[PDB]
């Protein structure tokens, strides 16, 4: 048995749990990377890169925000992994089975990710494999930091033709904090998961060298809006647009997932491609 201290409390889990339930897609992609058998997940909306798990091979335990608590009672999980989207449901889930919070601390992204991945390693007897995969991600980080130098960036999320911004220490702060991309707005302190609502005027005025764009609507709705939103008078005149430095980050990772061995690796590859 393992005793796990996390941001929301403490859990007790058998090592090598057989019936694994996952509500965080970063953890799901970690288990997939390590070849750990998964029992169930919310299949209402699954990231494209994880569509293996949209299959009938797996039990459907609802949506990210609305678990199927009955179907969970029918499984009786050895462990339930949750992150931010389910934090408000910590107490209800804890009633059904061992429940581990495994979101990232955005103020300490690398250390929190490392801790989270090492817990997974310990739990499934995959300790050294995780240690090596973390090192391989670090090799990506050290290279990208050099390409990132001197390139002022802004991070935006688009939905419905409108935008929010994120900077240092935010949900998407790893672009600045981990990958060493300078912030076009250093005084932008954001903790809203949905970003700070901003205008196109704000983006134009900040006039970033690079604009990282995360299209919510591509994943939540099935209709891309990011290129339409960006194709706008105030953005089209930015350095970022004129220099071909609008970087459409894949929202299947950035919006729906993050914090896993595969997603963090792929997220860094997407940044690096954008900086190249």
Numbering used by the authors: 25 to 300
Question: What's in the article?
Answer:
They are homologues of the well characterized protein CjCeuE from Campylobacter jejuni. The proteins have a two-domain structure, with the domains linked by a long α-helix at the base of the fold. The siderophore binding sites sit between the two domains.
There is a single molecule in the asymmetric unit with a continuous chain from Met26 through to the C-terminal Lys300. The predicted and experimental apo Gst structures had an r.m.s.d. between all 273 Cα atoms of 0.62 Å. Thus, the AF2 model has accurately predicted the fold in the experimental apo structure around the ligand-binding site. In contrast, the histidine loop is already in the closed, iron-chelating position in the apo structures of the thermophilic proteins. It should of course be noted that these structures are from crystals cryogenically frozen at 100 K and that in natural Gst cells at their optimum growth temperature of around 65°C the His218 loop might well open up, as seen in CjCeuE. Apo Pth and Gst have a higher thermal unfolding transition midpoint (T m) and are substantially more thermostable than CjCeuE.
